[PDB]
Ligand binder design. Structure first.
Ligand SMILES: *[C@@H]1O[C@H](CO)[C@@H](O)[C@H](O)[C@H]1NC(C)=O
Length: 118
């Protein structure tokens, strides 16, 4: 499913995927697992997620036990949208819940969605 917002094209994937498989699946659709750099793009995706009702992988990850989180598509930005204190602490790869808020978890976990953008 393809959506437009701002000057951005989003693709919403519904498939059983680990975070690594979401990286792959987005690329197979000529896109990249999403980076979320401000409150406006976040609010657009919150509406999308709340209408779908289930968690989607996003392109944020850490290799230093959560000291630093980076976007897989290379974007540099200060914006964060964590659910709570604990959510930044629980794992290496990040998803957005059905209310748009971010959580970290094991990259080998399975979710049924990913958000990509071009
Ligand atoms: C997702 O794929 C994994 C790996 O094959 C499988 O073990 C798991 O049961 C699947 N989950 C769903 C909901 O299809």
């Amino acid at each position: 499913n393809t959506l437009e917002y701002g000057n951005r094209t989003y693709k919403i994937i519904n498939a059983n995927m680990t975070w690594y498989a979401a990286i792959k699946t987005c690329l197979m659709h000529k896109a990249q697992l999403v980076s979320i750099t401000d409150q406006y793009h976040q609010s657009f995706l919150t509406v999308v997620l709340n209408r779908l009702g289930y968690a989607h992988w996003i392109g944020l990850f850490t290799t230093d036990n959560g000291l630093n989180f980076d976007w897989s598509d290379g974007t540099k930005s200060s914006f964060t949208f964590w659910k709570d204190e604990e959510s930044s602490l629980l794992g290496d790869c990040v998803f957005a819940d059905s209310n748009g808020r971010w959580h970290s978890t094991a990259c080998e976990s399975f979710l049924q969605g990913a958000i990509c953008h071009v």
